[PDB]
Symmetry: C3
Subunit: 243 residues, 3 copies
Amino acid sequence: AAAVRENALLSSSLWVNVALAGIAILVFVYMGRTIRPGRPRLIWGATLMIPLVSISSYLGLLSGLTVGMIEMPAGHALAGEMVRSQWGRYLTWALSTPMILLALGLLADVDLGSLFTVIAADIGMCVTGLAAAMTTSALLFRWAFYAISCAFFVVVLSALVTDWAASASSAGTAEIFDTLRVLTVVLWLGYPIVWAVGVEGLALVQSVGVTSWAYSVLDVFAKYVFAFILLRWVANNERTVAV
Amino acid sequence: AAAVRENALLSSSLWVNVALAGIAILVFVYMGRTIRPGRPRLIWGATLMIPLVSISSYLGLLSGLTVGMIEMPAGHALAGEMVRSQWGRYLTWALSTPMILLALGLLADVDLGSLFTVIAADIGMCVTGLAAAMTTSALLFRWAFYAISCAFFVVVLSALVTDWAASASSAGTAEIFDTLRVLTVVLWLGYPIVWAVGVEGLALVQSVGVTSWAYSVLDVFAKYVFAFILLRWVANNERTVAV
Amino acid sequence: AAAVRENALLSSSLWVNVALAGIAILVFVYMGRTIRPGRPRLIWGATLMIPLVSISSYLGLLSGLTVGMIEMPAGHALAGEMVRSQWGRYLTWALSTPMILLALGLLADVDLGSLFTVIAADIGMCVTGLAAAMTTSALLFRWAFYAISCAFFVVVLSALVTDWAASASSAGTAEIFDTLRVLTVVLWLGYPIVWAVGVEGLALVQSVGVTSWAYSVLDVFAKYVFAFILLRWVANNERTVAV
Ligand SMILES: *C/C=C(C)/C=C/C=C(C)/C=C/C1=C(C)CCCC1(C)C
Ligand SMILES: *C/C=C(C)/C=C/C=C(C)/C=C/C1=C(C)CCCC1(C)C
Ligand SMILES: *C/C=C(C)/C=C/C=C(C)/C=C/C1=C(C)CCCC1(C)C
Ligand SMILES: CCCCCCCCO[C@@H]1O[C@H](CO)[C@@H](O)[C@H](O)[C@H]1O
Ligand SMILES: CCCCCCCCO[C@@H]1O[C@H](CO)[C@@H](O)[C@H](O)[C@H]1O
Ligand SMILES: CCCCCCCCO[C@@H]1O[C@H](CO)[C@@H](O)[C@H](O)[C@H]1O
Ligand SMILES: [Br-]
Ligand SMILES: [Br-]
Ligand SMILES: [Br-]
Ligand SMILES: [Br-]
Ligand SMILES: [Br-]
Ligand SMILES: [Br-]
């Protein structure tokens, strides 16, 4: 009745996003039929990858393929216990969050060099996050990895709010880029807060069911809604984008 | 005499392509001595990577490093048995099939955005294929992963047959691009057919020796012959390509 | 007193570079405050990633997350024994050595195609190196992987010394590119020599403490000093670089 409850929280939190990612793919495909080949069609292709990765990720977690048990180190609020870890999330972020950055980058028309470095910083953020969840030898190391990951995040954040906005202004998309940048910054901040507050971190919240739902809700906005806003603006502003 | 036979099928299927990939590298290097630095030399560099990855892949499988046993889930034609899985193949495809796409892309002179998205879809195809072979918890999940992988493949296929052909026409290479696109589409289709028909899939064919040979033969055409045709046309048409 | 000594060699060899990478990040950040946004700021962003990856790598090894024991195959100087392997190094190289190549590439203003192929060859070099250290089934295979890895290295080396220098000449940076290319070639050569001479290879040197220190010292020059020279020249030559 707490295990019954913890398991109902887990499975529902995964099944919903398998549904919602699936539906988003369908809708994004239907939307792409009335978009002119070119720079709009490039932004659309990049955008469609986002839920395709997300549904893969969630099939990963549902099947157990990318879920494991981790013994928490001495000093942890749950020291000496095996904790459920959805390390599949941290893994697939490393492919899905660069799809987001590619869409934005194409939208804001950035320098490929800036693009390559941001995406590199982003893959570093994701991988050191996974290192943090997997590290079992000491509490010191888990949070050192957390902090390195934050440093990467900052690199990604800086480029958005400076260079990429600058590129957006002279590409004619500064306004829509600024709507999306805000969503992205606000919502991406949710993830390290969830990690820290949740069971892998401080464990102020000890239900993995709850933390899993927290990530799932964040995915809904950061991926599917983000992607839907992008596509609606692009289909309405095709000339403002092409060439 | 069936184990003697299954093992002779396996080892020969791997050793041949170690030989053939090795020879292709030698020949491609010799061919590259009479190619002018520039766009031809870029296509050649990209093309040479193809067998270099392939020989690595096959050394992986021969040494056992990238081969494992997988228990098939309930409902599978071979439910409850350990099946030999050459998961090394699925792994290295994720680096070799983007080398192919890079060669084609350079040949057809595509938009880097289209390039980045195709390659991303391609890496998604390969990784979800591996997810499908590794999934053991249920039959449903194995084929859901198969289907997601097909969705990625379709993304890759669409870009070739539309955008990338369009780019080929105005880059002066539409004719050679169209020869290569056809080879690629026809032969890449062979891979999910082999998976489905073979032991990891439906198991209409239960010899892993046979399925391994089927992949090996597909590699011969999709990589080595593909790469040989590309290089012969490029060395004969260097002006039609440069700048 | 030999175990006491072997362990003091190991931990000091890792802790030093956690320190030094940490300090380099601080200094590189401080240096980047007086660099004009643009092509200089792109080179700086790429350069800063280098120690960020390196410190991650070393936190990986210190925590045990990326260290393992490997049984050496028959015919090895240490056949039948478990050897300490810092496979974390081989792993993270695959992300850090492309940051180096990106910096150089941005500095020399190369063709993205050459860039993509070099980086691909570089990731191949790193991954087949890891294959070599992990292979346990036979000595033949370990060195075949060593040799494939060398072939990749050669691809990377050729592009530097020909194409990328050519690009450097007409981008106005040939002189600084040539200083950096020399450092890179000389120092990157150190790594397969250390592997071969050390315990994973021939085992002319059987202390993993010693080989670990050898890699650590190579990182100091190939990453931190390399990166420091790059940044000092860029801050002094911003007009020679921009646009
Ligand atoms: C669709 C998935 C998204 C938008 C995920 C974003 C994830 C992050 C921004 C993760 C951030 C983390 C840190 C910044 C610190 C360490 C832990 C992480 C990985 C949760
Ligand atoms: C050199 C290697 C090549 C050309 C491999 C190509 C592999 C594919 C096109 C794989 C396709 C698959 C699907 C489309 C569905 C699921 C199973 C796979 C990975 C076999
Ligand atoms: C910062 C890390 C650097 C600069 C590492 C460079 C590593 C190499 C150049 C590795 C080379 C190897 C070979 C060329 C052969 C096989 C073994 C390796 C991976 C050590
Ligand atoms: C979000 C920033 C946190 C960084 C410092 C982490 C604090 C050290 O670690 C934390 O210590 C807590 C109190 O002992 C425990 O409750 C947590 O489980 C543990 O992770
Ligand atoms: C190629 C498209 C196939 C998708 C549906 C797969 C069918 C469900 O799965 C299949 O069921 C078969 C019959 O029970 C078994 O023989 C197979 O081993 C099993 O994989
Ligand atoms: C650096 C180039 C070396 C390639 C050939 C490796 C030699 C075969 O392998 C080596 O044989 C040696 C002598 O038996 C042993 O001491 C080593 O441990 C073993 O790795
Ligand atoms: Br779960
Ligand atoms: Br994801
Ligand atoms: Br095999
Ligand atoms: Br391959
Ligand atoms: Br160690
Ligand atoms: Br590193």
